[PDB]
């Protein structure tokens, strides 16, 4: 067991570097248009109360340098969809993968390619968090970077990196250029949420743990829904649905034990920690693999 | 975060190889596909293989190749070592920029992990000093590739033959030579009792003062002999001066010298952790090297 990323290869060939003055940042090239965040038109002196419409009106075509490893693209036109810029360019990307784009929900996770100046330079997986942000790995310079799943040869794109909270986790949108969660791409006082655990993740790697041999957590006791959710929640667990339920019936039918119980074993884990012993290489509770990334692994 | 290499220079280079039965993965590299030897192997040959005489009963072709949807004639057959070298009438178009290196223990590297010749995910794993690697295979995926990557060029390292009784995984380099004391027969074999790598827990350290975790820093500083004989005691490997040089750039960019890091790591050993997280691990990590948190950080 291993945090499995996607192949990137499908979203390499689509990164590409885009200057907008003297700020330079990632964008995506699909087809013939190059999407990134609007705020590369922005020289964070606008960033307090930037009016985006004054900003892009003021913009021409050749304002928008975009380089796509050693060749120069020439930008066409250009239109604002949310908090994304769509540049259309000249050259359609013979690169271009099938692909759609997907808004996710909370608890799912994705691939990301970290990129810099338009070059990738690595990939790991993460998860949307209840509070929608994301803990990822990024520097300067890497805002466009993308978040992206692919199931069956189709690239779903799903995240597209916009900003790092003091906190030190990250913010951004979909590639429709809604933000996840309540944040806005300006200079204001914005924190993330208290954040919760992604409990029906936590319940599919313990699954998981036991495909791969291990038994030694679980117990003899069973749970209501309810009863569970309400000692869930005072750790800071997200309550458990009726949808999370059914959707660990898979995995509870391969391993014969059924999500109720399972559920009685995360109560005693919370409340009596490991016992010096680890699950899966992991000494805490592990809530970035969801049900169907348990069922794609093993 | 555990980062990979990003694998679209590999993936290309994937393809699908068939021995009667038997189907494993294959490295396409120019006119050559690079596959574990033991793919003309049946379970009953295993028992005493004798490679040689199992590899001249055959012909090129009883090798089924396949590049996704098109299948790749094979024309020659060779061994190197434990890898099978069958030459194909066609190039590889995507063969990038390589190289064949042998990695040390201790060293870090991306499995693209490959089933049916088709790339199914991408992680980052270690070297053991046991030399086994703690990856994620199942049934399928012999002939997965290990590689790093430099500036365009694919070093590629490791290519995946077995899985041990406890659930790790042992292979060769690309020349076929194995890591580890390890052979492709069926016999009885086991990892050995392994070490923990004391230069990526210190490299780990230094990430995680580089983002912001300092609340194990002391006072206290130590030498290269008092801190080997803690090392010994706690089955971590020796640190030796190559790794303290090792570890030069993360001591000026934190300002924190080596030694000092070690009487860190000392206290670490000796009370634990008390309930607190480094990098939201409750544990020490040593699966990033020095050169992984300089290239990430
Ligand atoms: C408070 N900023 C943010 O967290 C955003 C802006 C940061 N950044 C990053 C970046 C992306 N991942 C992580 C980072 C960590 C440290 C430093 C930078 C980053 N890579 C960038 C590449 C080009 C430009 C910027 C940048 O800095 N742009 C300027 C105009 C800016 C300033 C304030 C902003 C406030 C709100 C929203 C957008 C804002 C934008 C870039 C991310
Ligand atoms: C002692 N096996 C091993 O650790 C490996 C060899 C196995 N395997 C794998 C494979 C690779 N990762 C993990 C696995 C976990 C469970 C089952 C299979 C695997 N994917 C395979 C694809 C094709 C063939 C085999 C296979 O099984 N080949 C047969 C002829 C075989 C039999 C005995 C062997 C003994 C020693 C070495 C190689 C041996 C090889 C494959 C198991």
Same mark, same amino acid.
């Given at each position: 067991?291993?945090?499995?990323?996607?192949?990137?290869?499908?979203?390499?060939?689509? #990164?590409?570097?885009?200057?907008?003055?003297?700020?330079?940042?990632?964008?995506? $090239?699909?087809?013939?248009?190059?999407?990134?965040?609007?705020?590369?038109?922005?020289?964070?002196?606008?960033?307090?109360?930037?009016?985006?419409?004054?900003?892009?009106?003021?913009?021409?075509?050749?304002?928008?340098?975009?380089?796509?490893?050693?060749?120069?693209?020439?930008?066409?036109?250009?239109?604002?969809?949310?908090?994304?810029?769509?540049?259309?360019?000249?050259?359609?990307?013979?690169?271009?993968?099938?692909?759609?784009?997907?808004?996710?929900?909370?608890?799912?996770?994705?691939? @990301?390619?970290?990129?810099?100046?338009?070059?990738?330079?690595?990939?790991?997986?993460?998860?949307?968090?209840?509070?929608?942000?994301?803990?990822?790995?990024?520097?300067?310079?890497?805002?466009?970077?993308?978040?992206?799943?692919?199931?069956?040869?189709?690239?779903?794109?799903?995240?597209?990196?916009? #900003?790092?909270?003091?906190?030190?986790?990250?913010?951004?949108?979909?590639?429709?250029?809604?933000?996840?969660?309540?944040? @806005?791409?300006?200079?204001?006082?914005?924190?993330?949420?208290?954040?919760?655990?992604?409990?029906?993740?936590?319940?599919? $790697?313990?699954?998981?743990?036991?495909?791969?041999?291990?038994? $030694?957590?679980?117990?003899?006791?069973?749970?209501?829904?309810?009863?569970?959710?309400?000692?869930? #929640?005072?750790?800071?667990?997200?309550?458990?649905?009726?949808?999370?339920?059914?959707?660990?019936?898979?995995?509870?039918?391969?391993?014969?034990?059924?999500?109720?119980?399972?559920?009685?074993?995360?109560?005693?884990?919370?409340?009596?920690?490991?016992?010096?012993?680890?699950?899966?290489?992991?000494?805490?509770?592990?809530?970035?693999?969801?049900?169907?990334?348990?069922?794609?692994?093993?």
């Amino acid at each position: 067991f291993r945090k499995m990323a996607f192949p990137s290869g499908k979203v390499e060939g689509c #990164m590409v570097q885009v200057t907008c003055g003297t700020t330079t940042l990632n964008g995506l $090239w699909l087809d013939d248009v190059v999407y990134c965040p609007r705020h590369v038109i922005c020289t964070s002196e606008d960033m307090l109360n930037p009016n985006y419409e004054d900003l892009l009106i003021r913009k021409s075509n050749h304002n928008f340098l975009v380089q796509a490893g050693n060749v120069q693209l020439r930008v066409i036109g250009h239109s604002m969809q949310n908090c994304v810029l769509k540049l259309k360019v000249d050259t359609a990307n013979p690169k271009t993968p099938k692909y759609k784009f997907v808004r996710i929900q909370p608890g799912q996770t994705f691939s @990301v390619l970290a990129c810099y100046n338009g070059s990738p330079s690595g990939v790991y997986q993460c998860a949307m968090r209840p509070n929608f942000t994301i803990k990822g790995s990024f520097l300067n310079g890497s805002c466009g970077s993308v978040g992206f799943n692919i199931d069956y040869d189709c690239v779903s794109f799903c995240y597209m990196h916009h #900003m790092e909270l003091p906190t030190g986790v990250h913010v951004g949108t979909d590639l429709e250029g809604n933000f996840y969660g309540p944040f @806005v791409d300006r200079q204001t006082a914005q924190a993330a949420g208290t954040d919760t655990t992604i409990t029906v993740n936590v319940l599919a $790697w313990l699954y998981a743990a036991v495909i791969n041999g291990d038994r $030694w957590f679980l117990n003899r006791f069973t749970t209501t829904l309810n009863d569970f959710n309400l000692v869930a #929640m005072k750790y800071n667990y997200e309550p458990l649905t009726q949808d999370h339920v059914d959707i660990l019936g898979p995995l509870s039918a391969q391993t014969g034990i059924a999500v109720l119980d399972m559920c009685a074993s995360l109560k005693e884990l919370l409340q009596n920690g490991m016992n010096g012993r680890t699950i899966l290489g992991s000494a805490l509770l592990e809530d970035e693999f969801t049900p169907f990334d348990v069922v794609r692994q093993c």
